[PDB]
Amino acid sequence: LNGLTDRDLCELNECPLDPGGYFIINGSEKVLIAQEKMATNTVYVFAKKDSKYAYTGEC
């Protein structure tokens, strides 16, 4: 469907408004939810109370 015109998408029985961005797995539209995480390669200094450590420089 890349760059494919609205005429052609309708000819494919596709919807020209459909956004894309999902997979078809065994017929199911499967979206990959963006998973949040701590940034890599970046130092972070935290205080973890209830521990022997006053401060912790994580990386």
Binding site: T5, D6, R7, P16
Partner: protein, 39 residues
Amino acid sequence: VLLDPADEKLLEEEIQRSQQHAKVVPWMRKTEYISTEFN
């Protein structure tokens, strides 16, 4: 045969209001329908 527009208007009895739907208003707009070709 003579037919002046100033005489044509006097043939009617009374035919000659407000247009306040058209008024330009910055918090209001217009509308949009379904074409066949777009982005």
